[PDB]
Design an enzyme around this catalytic site. Structure first.
Site, PDB file in Angstrom:
ATOM      1  N   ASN A 144     -31.820 -14.338  -5.988  1.00 45.91           N
ATOM      2  CA  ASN A 144     -31.435 -15.730  -6.130  1.00 45.91           C
ATOM      3  C   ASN A 144     -31.863 -16.277  -7.486  1.00 45.91           C
ATOM      4  O   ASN A 144     -32.710 -15.699  -8.158  1.00 45.91           O
ATOM      5  CB  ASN A 144     -32.022 -16.538  -4.984  1.00 45.91           C
ATOM      6  CG  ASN A 144     -31.643 -15.968  -3.629  1.00 45.91           C
ATOM      7  OD1 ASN A 144     -32.491 -15.822  -2.757  1.00 45.91           O
ATOM      8  ND2 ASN A 144     -30.360 -15.626  -3.450  1.00 45.91           N
TER       9      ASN A 144
ATOM     10  N   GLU B  48     -22.733 -12.368   4.877  1.00 49.50           N
ATOM     11  CA  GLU B  48     -24.050 -12.289   4.207  1.00 49.50           C
ATOM     12  C   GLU B  48     -24.292 -10.903   3.580  1.00 49.50           C
ATOM     13  O   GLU B  48     -24.498 -10.764   2.370  1.00 49.50           O
ATOM     14  CB  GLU B  48     -25.190 -12.618   5.187  1.00 49.50           C
ATOM     15  CG  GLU B  48     -25.268 -14.075   5.620  1.00 49.50           C
ATOM     16  CD  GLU B  48     -25.724 -15.035   4.522  1.00 49.50           C
ATOM     17  OE1 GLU B  48     -26.033 -14.622   3.392  1.00 49.50           O
ATOM     18  OE2 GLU B  48     -25.782 -16.237   4.794  1.00 49.50           O
TER      19      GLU B  48
END
Length: 129
Positions: free
Chosen positions: A46, A35
């Site tokens: 995002n 991550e």
């Protein structure tokens, strides 16, 4: 702060993450690895415009307030800047909330596509915990 593999595992264990909701410590280390790469300052935008924050790349859409994710929630009741601190306490506290729902650690894309099904135990191998 960029963590060491074992340093981090040790810190997460201290915070009640080893076998939390049935997920052994190696799963959590593995997630952090893929991550953030153990870097607490990782941020990632995002496509929908939410931003992923910290060691476990927690999302502004649901979990924290970054003040720029329209229509979002803040189910962990924290500024997303709270997730880049080198004290992993808010990241971990907020992780327990995310994993306690119904999709478990499948909430973390990197876990599902890179940890789920692996010898995750290898991530705490040779760590004095």
């Amino acid at each position: 702060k960029v963590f060491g593999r074992c340093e981090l595992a040790a810190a997460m264990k201290r915070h009640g993450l080893d076998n939390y909701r049935g997920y052994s410590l190696g799963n959590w280390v593995c997630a952090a690895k893929f991550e953030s790469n153990f870097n607490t300052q990782a941020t990632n935008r995002n496509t929908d415009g939410s931003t992923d924050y910290g060691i476990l790349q927690i999302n502004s859409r649901w979990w924290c307030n970054d003040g720029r994710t329209p229509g979002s929630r803040n189910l962990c009741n924290i500024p997303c800047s709270a997730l880049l601190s080198s004290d992993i306490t808010a990241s971990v506290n907020c992780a327990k909330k995310i994993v306690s729902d119904g999709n478990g650690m499948n909430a973390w894309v990197a876990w599902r596509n890179r940890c789920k099904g692996t010898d995750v135990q290898a991530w705490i191998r040779g760590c004095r915990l």
